[PDB]
C-alpha cells in the first residue's frame with residue numbers, strides 16, 4: 001500500500017545468519033607428458049622427440065596451474081600477519097560462540113561446523129601411478145584451520161581494527177553496538193535488549209549446523225569435475241585411434257620395426273590430442289576457480305575484517321559481521337545480518353512548520369501516533385518528542401509541499417518558568 | 418536448420434524477464450531500498466529522494482525546497498534518454514557484437 | 517574407436533547452456549516476491565511512465 | 567579438429583560472458599536495491615538511484 | 617649448493633610428506649620462509665651456512 | 681523460382697532440386713526430417729520410478 005502521506009517503520013528486528021560457500025582451490029595434478037603417451041618405450045620416446053616441444057609446454061602449463069592454486073589458498077586465508085588467541089574465559093556478554101572457534105578436546109583442532117563441513121565432502125583418487133601424480137597443498141588443513149581461528153579471534157576480541165593496524169581490544173557488546181550504529185540504528189537499541197539479541201544470535205548459530213546436516217554443491221561439483229576429467233583422460237589410453245592395438249608393446253612385438261612407426265605415430269597423435277584437450281580444459285577451469293578465489297578473498301577482506309555497506313555482498317539484509325570457516329578446498333562464510341520485522345504504518349510529513357519557520361529532522365523521520373506527531377530513527381521505531389535538538393530550521397514552509405502544522409518543544413522554556 | 422546444430426530455448430522467457438524487471442522497478446519506486454533487505458516498507462517517493470539526497474551529503478531541505486525543479490529535470494532526462502537511445506545504431510553494440 | 521571426444525564436447529556445451537540459465541536467473545531474480553505499482557501515479561511530480 | 571576449436575572458443579566466450587553477468591548482478595544488487603558509495607560504479611557523478 | 621627433492625619415494629636424509637628430501641636438514645624451531653616445498657614444510661638458506669627445511673610459521677603469535 | 685538452366689541448388693551445403701529426369705522436370709526442395717535430441721525427467725530413483 002502506497003500513499004503520499006504514509007510510511008512503514010519496523011518495530012522489531014531478527015538477527016539471521018547465512019552460509020555462503022566458495023571454492024578457493026582445486027586439487028593440483030602434474031602428468032608426465034613423455035611418460036603418459038609412451039609407456040616406458042625407447043622407440044616411442046625416440047619417435048616423440050621429433051614431435052616438437054609439446055611436452056615441455058604442457059608441463060609448464062600444469063606447473064603454473066598448481067602454483068596459482070597455492071597462491072589462491074595463501075591469498076584467501078593469510079590476510080593476517082599475526083596469530084590471535086581467544087582468551088580462556090568465554091565471557092562475551094551472552095553470545096555463545098562455542099560453535100565457531102575450535103574445541104581443544106578433539107585432536108583435529110577444528111570447530112564443530114568446520115568438522116561437519118570436513119566430514120560432509122568426500123578411480124577418483126586411485127589411478128595407480130599411470131604417469132600422473134598429485135602434489136600436496138602448500139598449506140596443510142591444520143595451518144588453514146589455524147589461520148581461520150586467528151581471524152575468528154581477531155574479529156571477536158578486537159572488532160574490525162585488527163585488520164587496519166594493531167589489534168585494539170574492545171568488549172563484544174560495544175563492538176556490536178558499533179556495528180548497529182554502522183547499519184543505521186542507534187546503539188542504544190542494542191543495550192536496551194542486549195540479552196534478547198544474544199539469545200537470537202545463539203539460536204541462529206544453532207540452526208546452520210542442522211541446515212548443513214541435511215548444501216556443499218559448489219565444492220562437491222568442483223571435486224567431481226576434476227576427478228571425472230582425470231578419469232576420462234586416463235581411460236583414453238585404451239582407444240585404438242585407428243591403430244592395430246591400443247598397447248605399444250603389442251604393436252611393437254606383432255609388427256616389424258619399419259612398418260610399425262606408421263601405426264605408432266597415429267597412437268602418439270591421439271594420446272597427445274587427448275592430453276592437450278585435458279590441459280586446455282584444466283586451464284579454463286583454473287581460470288574460473290581463480291576468479292572464484294579472488295571473489296572469496298574480497299569477501300573475506302571486506303565482510304570479515306570490516307563492515308560492508310554494499311547491499312547484497314555479505315548476505316541478505318543489513319550486514320552486521322561475518323565469521324569465516326575452512327572447508328575441503330573451499331571457504332564457508334557465516335554472515336551475521338540484521339533484518340527488520342513487525343512493521344507498522346503511520347502517516348508522515350516531510351517537515352513541520354510553526355511561527356513561520358519550517359523544521360526538518362536531523363536524522364530520522366516524522367510519524368503520527370494518531371493525534372500527536374513524533375520524530376523517530378529510520379529503521380527501528382522509537383518515538384521522541386519533536387524538540388529543537390532533533391530538528392533543524394530552513395525556510396518558512398511556503399515552498400515545501402506536505403507541511404503539517406505542529407509545535408516544537410524548546411528545552412530552554414521550562415528554565416524561564 | 419542445419420545438420421546437427423540446434424538451439425535450446427532460454428529457461429526464462431522474455432515475458433518473465435520483463436515481469437522481474439517490472440517487479441524490481443515497482444519495489445524501488447514504492448519502497449526505496451528496504452525491499453532488498455527484508456520486508457518491503459512503503460515510503461513516499463519525495464521522502465525517499467530526500468533520503469537519497471541525505472546519503473550523498475546534500476541536506477534534506479534542498480529537495481523539499483526544489484522538488485518541482487528536481488521532478489522537471491528527472492522527466493526531461495528520461496525523455497532525452499528515450500529519444501537518444503534511437504539515434505545511433507551503436508548504442509546497443511555491447512549486446513549486438515556478442516550475438 | 518577415436519576415444520570419448522564426443523562425450524567431452526557434449527558435456528562442455530551442455531555445461532555452457534546451463535550456465536547461461538544460471539547467469540540470467542542470478543542477474544534478474546534478485547527478489548522472490550514480485551511487486552505491483554499502485555493504480556494512482558501520484559509520485560509527487562516524478563514521471564515514471566517511460 | 568574444427569569442432570574442438572569451436573568448443574574451446576565457446577568456452578572462452580562463455581567465461582567472458584559469465585564475468586560480465588556477475589558484474590551485472592553485482593550492479594543490480596548494489597545500485598538498484600540500494601545506494602552505492604562507490605564513486606564510478608553507477609555512472610558519472612554522485613549516485614542517487616537506478 | 618642446492619638440495620634435491622623427489623616426489624613419491626619411500627626414502628643428511630629427511631623424510632617429507634611431499635617426498636624424500638636430501639641436501640638439507642630440518643630444524644626444530646620455525647621461521648617464515650620463501651622457498652615453498654609442500655605439505656606445510658618449506659626450505660631456505662641460513663647461516664657455516666647451509667640450506668634448512670622446516671614447517672612454516674604462520675606469524676608472530678600474540679594474544680590481546 | 682529458378683532460371684531454366686540450372687540443375688542443383690544450395691545455400692550452404694545442399695537443398696538441391698530439379699529431378700534429373702529428361703522427360704519430366706520439377707523443383708523438389710531437400711530438407712531433413714526433424715532430427716532431435718531426447719531428454720528425460722526423473723523425480724529421483726529413490727523417490728519414485
Ligand SMILES: *[C@@H]1O[C@H](CO)[C@@H](O[C@@H]2O[C@H](CO)[C@@H](O)[C@H](O)[C@H]2NC(C)=O)[C@H](O)[C@H]1NC(C)=O
Pocket residue numbers: 557563564565
Ligand atoms: C508523463 O509523460 C507521458 C509521456 O507520454 C505523458 O503522456 C502524455 O499524456 C497526454 C494526456 O492525454 C497525451 O496527450 C500525450 O500525448 C502523452 N505524451 C506526451 C509526450 O505528452 C504524461 O501526461 C506525463 N504525466 C503523467 C502523470 O503520466
Ligand SMILES: *[C@@H]1O[C@H](CO)[C@@H](O)[C@H](O)[C@H]1NC(C)=O
Pocket residue numbers: 011012013
Ligand atoms: C521481537 O520478536 C521477538 C521474537 O521472539 C520477541 O521475543 C520480542 O518480544 C519482539 N519485540 C518486542 C518489542 O516485542
Ligand SMILES: *[C@@H]1O[C@H](CO)[C@@H](O)[C@H](O)[C@H]1NC(C)=O
Pocket residue numbers: 369370371372
Ligand atoms: C497517542 O498516544 C497516546 C499516549 O497517551 C495514546 O493513549 C493514544 O492511544 C495514541 N493514539 C492512538 C491513535 O493510538
Ligand SMILES: *[C@@H]1O[C@H](CO)[C@@H](O)[C@H](O)[C@H]1NC(C)=O
Pocket residue numbers: 004005401402403558
Ligand atoms: C496526497 O494526495 C492527495 C490526493 O489523493 C491530495 O489530496 C493530498 O493533498 C496529497 N498530500 C500531499 C502531502 O501531497
Ligand SMILES: *[C@@H]1O[C@H](CO)[C@@H](O)[C@H](O)[C@H]1NC(C)=O
Pocket residue numbers: 404405
Ligand atoms: C498552519 O498555520 C498557519 C498559520 O497559523 C495557517 O495559515 C495554515 O493554514 C495552517 N496549516 C493547516 C494545514 O491548517
Ligand SMILES: *[C@@H]1O[C@H](CO)[C@@H](O)[C@H](O)[C@H]1NC(C)=O
Pocket residue numbers: 626627
Ligand atoms: C617408508 O619407509 C619407512 C622406513 O622403512 C616405513 O616405516 C614406512 O612404512 C614407509 N612408507 C611407505 C608409504 O612406504
Ligand SMILES: *[C@@H]1O[C@H](CO)[C@@H](O)[C@H](O)[C@H]1NC(C)=O
Pocket residue numbers: 642643644
Ligand atoms: C629436536 O628435539 C628433539 C627432542 O629433544 C631432538 O631429538 C632432535 O634432535 C631435535 N632436533 C635437532 C635438529 O636437534
Ligand SMILES: *[C@@H]1O[C@H](CO)[C@@H](O)[C@H](O)[C@H]1NC(C)=O
Pocket residue numbers: 726727
Ligand atoms: C534415497 O532415499 C533413501 C530413503 O531415505 C535414502 O536411504 C537414500 O540415501 C537416498 N539416496 C539414494 C541415492 O538412494
